[PDB]
Structures are given as C-alpha cells and as structure tokens.
C-alpha cells in the first residue's frame, strides 16, 4: 500500500536515497516508518525504525528522514554488499508495506565463470538414465549463453538450463543437464558443455 | 541470541488447510508481539496478523479475516499460523517474525520486526508430488584446486520445491555449493549439490550428502566414492 521505486542504481562511494509515499492518514500522521534489507534467499533484516532511528550494529551508513507524505532511505558510500531489496513500512491501522526497491551497484569489474561438467554417474545408468551435469559459477554480469555438443555437432534436445541467478559474493550462478539415454551416451565419442560469456567461451568436454 | 526456527515445506492441494509453527528462544516468549509475513515466490512482503502470546488476542489483515487463525503454546514457547481454503496465489514462503520492543513499549506491536524466521514454503498446487532420485558425483580434479578435488550429488525429478542438501550431517560446511533449481519442461525440478575437499582425504575420508525433500517425506544420505 506504500508506493516505492522498483529498482535503482548507484555507482560505488556515492549515495542514494530510495523514497516510501503514503499518504496523511499513515506517514503523514505518525513516527512509525520502518525499512528492511532482504538479500536473496534470506529473511528481511531491520535497519530503520521510527523513520530515522538504527537498530545496534546496523552501518551508521543507513539514515532515514521524513517529509510531509513520504519517508526516505539514504545510502552513503555505496558499496557493492548493499546490493539487495529494499523495503519501507508504516502503521496505518495494520502494518503496510512498500512494494520493494531492487538496488544496484554499478562499475562492478565482469568476472569470468568457472565451470565443472560431469559425466552421468554409473548408478544412473543402472537405472536406465543418463544426465550431464555443467555447473556455472562466479560470472559477471548475469548473462551466459550454454551450448552442448555431441562428437563435434550442436545438440538442442534434452538440454535444460537455469536463468542466472545471484549468489552471494554478488556474482552469478547458473546450472546446465543434458539428459540423454544410455545408447546415445555410450555410442559417441564424447560430449561438451560449451560456456560463452561476455564474448569469452568456456568448453569442458567428457567420454565414456 | 534471539532464534526462531520454523517447521518445514509443505504441499497442499487447493481447498485444504495448512498450519506452520514457530518456536522461539532467547527471549521472554510472552513479552512480545508475534507477527506472520508472507512472500510469494519474486513478490513483495505481506503482512496476514500478529498474536500476542500473552492472553492470546489475535489482530489480522482484513485480506485474511475468516481464513486465517493464528495461536500459541506457552509451554513450549511455539507460535502457530493456519490458513484454510488454500488456493494457488497463497504459494509463498510463510514467515513469523518478533516485534522490535516488548509490549510494555508505547505503539508495540506497530514498529517493526527484529527476529525472523527462516521461513516455510508452502506450495499450493494440483500436481502430483514426486520424491527426488539421488545420484552420487564421483570426484573431480579438473576444475578447482590446487590439491583438490570437487565431488556432489544429483537430485533429479522432484516436484514442488525445496529441497535442502546438507554434507556428512553438516559436519562439513566449507566448500559447499547447491546451485539453484532447474524447472525443466517435464514440470519436474532437478538441481546438484557439490563440495570441493583436500584430494588427500578422499582414499580416508567418507562424504555423504543428506537430501532433505519435506513435502514428499523423502530422505537420502548418499554416499559419493572414488
């Protein structure tokens, strides 16, 4: 019911601040602004409370403020661990939140993935099955492109592969399966995981 | 330390009822507001009500008033959270968390949440629930290291998520890296597990991976060999 900015960005060392409107009847009329820091795959975090005060231990680099309808968050020295989802809070009669503001933090250096491909193991292919498992990880920016081979030529069938998806050191992780019956596995010479990323490609390739 | 430990993923079908509980420690349990959050999966927050686990009295979201019933036991300082006639848009991690100040503080409970949860998935679907299949990933050398070597596990072919993979009863902790899921076009989930681990140890040491899938009822601990 509070109304926030989707997503902003800063560049690293400067400040940003994310603004929280209600109207008269809530922010207007009381003291009672909170805001919260939710990293992925975490609980919210308390780091703002009674619009300007910080909980012990959170950074004396978040500060909050008030004027008429809409509180604000600021951020001072942005550094690349504030990147996250930002959400503001007010009494209004019940506990009303804003609708999350994604931070983030420009001018981070690309960094190149790391990859390990494994070939299906042999209690698999007991059970009649075969997967190829190409794990992606610590990529900068979230963007890869994945391309499996059988022998030398492209395979598209059986191919599954996440969206990137942000770890916790702000770099990215993706994961790639190739599913295939044992025949096919076992009558090729070999097969490969093939990683392009900001131009730069990757390829881990294994055989029976 | 403040703790506040849920129970685990559910899956329901559409029309049923789920309960959560939340059982706190390192605090006065009586002395302060319960709230209940919700989070459907890449959404926002929503608040569903507090308790007061002193006497009892219960305050909800006019989204949730006649479908929701919050409680507590004293005795066993535990909260608990009921939603009823379940449909597909209540798929959401469920959250407890604990008022800022105890309830002698002027405006508790409306200042804030300091202690969450870790959180309760609850999957609200009509598909049919499959349990994981669990395949060790013998060890490899080839990536990482220097002396090292990475091994893992497969979980293949599970329906709603999550899944939680620990290492020998999580006694090993460093190292450890489960990738996030993939919704593949069967409609099922698969993802892996893997941990990289000093290539001396592997003729000494035994890894097993402990795959937890609460809302099949399924346990593996799968042994990963050389």
């Known amino acids: 019911a509070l109304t926030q900015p989707a997503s902003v960005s800063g560049s690293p060392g400067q400040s940003i601040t994310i603004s929280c409107t209600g109207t008269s009847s809530d922010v207007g009329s009381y003291n009672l602004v909170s805001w919260y820091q939710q990293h992925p795959g975490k609980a919210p975090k308390l780091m703002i409370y009674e619009v300007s005060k910080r909980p012990s231990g959170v950074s004396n680099r978040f500060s909050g403020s008030k004027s008429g309808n809409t509180a604000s968050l600021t951020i001072s020295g942005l550094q690349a661990e504030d990147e996250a989802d930002y959400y503001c809070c007010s009494y209004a009669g019940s506990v009303a939140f804003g609708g999350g503001t994604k931070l983030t933090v420009l001018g981070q250096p690309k960094a190149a993935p790391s990859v390990t491909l494994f070939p299906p193991s042999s209690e698999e292919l007991q059970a009649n099955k075969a997967t190829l498992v190409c794990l992606i990880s610590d990529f900068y920016p979230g963007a890869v492109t994945v391309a499996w081979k059988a022998d030398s030529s492209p395979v598209k069938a059986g191919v599954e592969t996440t969206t990137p998806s942000k770890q916790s050191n702000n770099k990215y992780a993706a994961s790639s399966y190739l599913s295939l019956t044992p025949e096919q596995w076992k009558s090729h010479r070999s097969y490969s995981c093939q990683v392009t990323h900001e131009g730069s490609t990757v390829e881990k390739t294994v055989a029976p | 330390q403040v703790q506040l430990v849920q129970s685990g993923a559910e899956v329901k079908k559409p029309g049923a009822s789920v309960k959560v509980s939340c059982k706190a420690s390192g605090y006065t349990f009586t002395g302060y507001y319960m709230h209940w959050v919700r989070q459907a999966p890449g959404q926002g927050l929503e608040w569903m009500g507090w308790i007061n686990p002193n006497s009892g009295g219960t305050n909800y979201a006019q989204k949730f008033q006649g479908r929701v019933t919050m409680t507590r036991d004293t005795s066993i300082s535990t909260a608990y959270m009921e939603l009823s006639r379940l449909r597909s848009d209540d798929t959401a991690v469920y959250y407890c968390?604990?008022?800022?100040?105890?309830?002698?503080?002027?405006?508790?409970?409306?200042?804030?949440?300091?202690?969450w949860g870790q959180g309760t998935l609850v999957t609200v679907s009509s598909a049919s629930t499959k349990g994981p299949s669990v395949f060790p990933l013998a060890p490899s050398s080839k990536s990482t290291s220097g002396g090292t070597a990475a091994l893992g596990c497969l979980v293949k072919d599970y329906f709603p998520e999550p899944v939680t993979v620990s290492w020998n009863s999580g006694a090993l902790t460093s190292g450890v890296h489960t990738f996030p899921a993939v919704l593949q076009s069967s409609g099922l989930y698969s993802l892996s597990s893997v941990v990289t681990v000093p290539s001396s140890s592997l003729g000494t040491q035994t890894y097993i991976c402990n795959v937890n899938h609460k809302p099949s009822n399924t346990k593996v601990d799968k042994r990963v060999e050389p």
């Open positions: 968390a604990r008022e800022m100040f105890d309830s002698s503080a002027d405006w508790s409970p409306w200042r804030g949440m300091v202690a």
